[PDB]
From TrEMBL, chain A:
Mg(2+) 3 binds at E50, E127. Zn(2+) 2 binds at H42, E137. This is Ferritin. Fe(3+) 2 binds at E18, E51, H54, E95, E131. It is found in: Cytoplasm. Mg(2+) 2 binds at Q47, E131, Q134. Mg(2+) 5 binds at D86. Zn(2+) 3 binds at E50, E127, E130, E131. Iron-storage protein.
Amino acid sequence: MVISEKVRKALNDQLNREIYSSYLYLSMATYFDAEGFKGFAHWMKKQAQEELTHAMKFYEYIYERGGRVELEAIEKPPSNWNGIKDAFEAALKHEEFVTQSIYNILELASEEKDHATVSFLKWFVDEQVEEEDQVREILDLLEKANGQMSVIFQLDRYLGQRE
Amino acid sequence: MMVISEKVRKALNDQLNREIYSSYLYLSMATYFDAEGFKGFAHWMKKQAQEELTHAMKFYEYIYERGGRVELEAIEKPPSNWNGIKDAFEAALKHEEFVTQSIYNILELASEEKDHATVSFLKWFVDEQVEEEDQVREILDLLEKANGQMSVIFQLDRYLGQRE
Amino acid sequence: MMVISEKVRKALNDQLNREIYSSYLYLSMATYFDAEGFKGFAHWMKKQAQEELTHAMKFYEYIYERGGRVELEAIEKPPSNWNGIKDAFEAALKHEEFVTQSIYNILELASEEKDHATVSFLKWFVDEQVEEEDQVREILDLLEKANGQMSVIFQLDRYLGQRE
Amino acid sequence: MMVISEKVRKALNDQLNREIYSSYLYLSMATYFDAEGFKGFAHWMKKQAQEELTHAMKFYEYIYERGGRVELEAIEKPPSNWNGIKDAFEAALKHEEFVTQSIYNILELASEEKDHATVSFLKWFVDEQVEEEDQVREILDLLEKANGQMSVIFQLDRYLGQRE
Amino acid sequence: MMVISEKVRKALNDQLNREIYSSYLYLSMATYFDAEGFKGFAHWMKKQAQEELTHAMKFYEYIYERGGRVELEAIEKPPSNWNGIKDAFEAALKHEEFVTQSIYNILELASEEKDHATVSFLKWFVDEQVEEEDQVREILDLLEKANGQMSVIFQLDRYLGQRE
Amino acid sequence: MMVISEKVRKALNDQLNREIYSSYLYLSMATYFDAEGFKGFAHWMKKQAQEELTHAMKFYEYIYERGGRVELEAIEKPPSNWNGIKDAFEAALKHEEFVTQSIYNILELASEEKDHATVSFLKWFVDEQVEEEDQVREILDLLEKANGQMSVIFQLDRYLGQRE
Ligand SMILES: [Fe+3]
Ligand SMILES: [Fe+3]
Ligand SMILES: [Fe+3]
Ligand SMILES: [Fe+3]
Ligand SMILES: [Fe+3]
Ligand SMILES: [Fe+3]
Ligand SMILES: [Fe+3]
Ligand SMILES: [Fe+3]
Ligand SMILES: [Fe+3]
Ligand SMILES: [Fe+3]
Ligand SMILES: [Fe+3]
Ligand SMILES: [Fe+3]
């Protein structure tokens, strides 16, 4: 194995955090479906799948550097939010935490002069920018919407079309 | 409003969480197979893991169709190591037969309450479990015949590595 | 909420305005070249002007992506004459090297603040600058090959007039 | 040798710089719409800005075609903040009617000098201004009817964000 | 003008000559495999040799984009013999790891000089080295499982002989 | 078992290494043309370098076809500087005439030993050398007709730069 044990641990930890992110977004989906917003729930199911592809990227990079993955327990996520906007605020807060988590691996890797891992992490830096922005844009629309059901209906239909 | 009983909703939600754990267990077998250098076996387990997620989502959508709600529970840490190829596939067979029995138990509970809609919904899973168990028994039979011979194991690994 | 610091956001916004000026400087070179008859040199500077606008719009979109705002500033009047071609293209090269250094300064600022998102975003512009600097250095080498001999300098005009 | 009067050249060069300012103004409106989170309004304005650059390039090319030369001037800092969506489009309409009058003044100067070429050339801009004022007047009428209502404003934003 | 330090141009020109030796070493490994009758292993090494040339030429073209010059140095005689298949691929892995550390040293030199253009250029090679090391490690894992068994080795020769 | 004599195998293995040196020499010439800003001439040389590698590999494969083995030798540092474009191409023609004579020497040795397989194999290179020499002579003649006229030189650079 040509990554350090400390960097293998950080990458393995982040893999498990990506799995939890997936599970959290699935849990938000369960909340949206309970509230009858099939389009919002669909957006979250697609988000969950996207998080799984991030975990598998960490998975394959670890083995590529001679390491091994160990899967850990996945914590029980919240299952309820105080309305659609509250759920997206929690999504944003979670994405920012993920970003900082990725930043911490990057700085560790840089400090150990593990350039291969620094470079690998660049894709996740850029992807985090995009994911934060998607949620921020949804939140700004919802702020403008205030309560309006007609606006919320359209947003649900639109996010219901995510590929 | 919910037209499944709370008992049947809990049994269905429990099984959804068991399907999620099944997925995680198979991903963990993949981590084992990748660590041992058998990328084909690992690929097979990653595809199996995706399959168990589709099962979880089938329970999910039926729960909502009947006015219920899903609650995701913590996922237990799976084992991450086995004593060999065969040991891992045998643990998979044992797990699948446990899943089948778990499904049988919901089926008999639904049947006792005369929830015919749920009994009928579970037929898909009864038939799928028959295929799932059989696929692992087949693999175990090929491994029994292979014995140690890496010439055979290489071809099995390549073969399972082609699963779509 | 804005997730770049106000220092980095001003550095990005300043550079956005510098890219707008670069576009205007090159259009002003196109006015010189077009006046002196060298239309091909001019068509090349109009293409370069359009390119610098795409640079500006990249800074623009990133600023909003990070929750900042863009503020457009006054654009200074650019030169409109140079002492012959090689004077102009040498002013271009010197300008692009100033752009490159300006970008480098943003990168080092972001790095010092641990704004890895802005550091990563700026890589594109580092790599582009390498290429912008080089296409000009190239043209300055060709002109110096044509001595002061006019019928070759016109030949270079026709090739730069090919830029897509 | 130049076959437009220096007075007509200056009037055309002035208008060229005015079209550049118009482009920059509409870009500044875009920065406002984007700051306010209306990406479709912002997109309309980015397309308007590109269209004003082509207007400037038509003046650019006619000037050199008649033997004149272009001199680019300083570009003033455009405003950055409007009271609300409707006020921004109202300022766009006011700006376009000012551009039209600016064009009208070139036309009547050219016509007094019997510069029939420049008169005929300006016709395209006269007809284009009629369309661009009309486009903004339509948006303003929709925004008038919407009154404050965010549901309708959102529909207009999506519609205007389709502009090709 | 050359806009890379002479220290950096030396480290890049040196690495280019190292890439050339790499190509030659793999060709020499091909000469070994072909003498042993393993045309598929030989073919893999001939493809590897060509790939190292694309690496050398990438350094080549960057050196000139930064205004530098390439000087080709003498190439040492590579080893022509190995003590079995495993020994040859182990030597290949040790060489790629040396090549990776060589690239790392250039990156740390460039970074200490704030030569961001070169730091960025070298990212491609950091990522490519990860893949190169991994392909060799994978080959060495399959070889370890094969043990000495010709029946498996012939399978591996077949697979590596497919490399495009 | 090797069915060429060791003397012929040595001569064929020496020529293989000479073809490798040819490839390296023509790349060094590329480094000179690129330093002098003639990217088309450099392109022609890089293409020639790859052509020389296909010559080396033809020798490589014939050696093994007759049961011999290839041994790669050290590659001498080539010159990197010429006193102009014509000087470099004169050095190329001189090199190809030396390659031609080296091939003649093998052919005469093989004919002495009544190695008719190898005599026949070398026919291809006799004919190819005639064309490799003619190609450089045509370039030298175009350069002579150019005299020192940078205009025509530029057209020759662009043309040779379209070599496939
Ligand atoms: Fe993620
Ligand atoms: Fe994410
Ligand atoms: Fe299942
Ligand atoms: Fe199953
Ligand atoms: Fe730029
Ligand atoms: Fe630029
Ligand atoms: Fe206009
Ligand atoms: Fe207009
Ligand atoms: Fe390499
Ligand atoms: Fe390599
Ligand atoms: Fe040759
Ligand atoms: Fe030759």
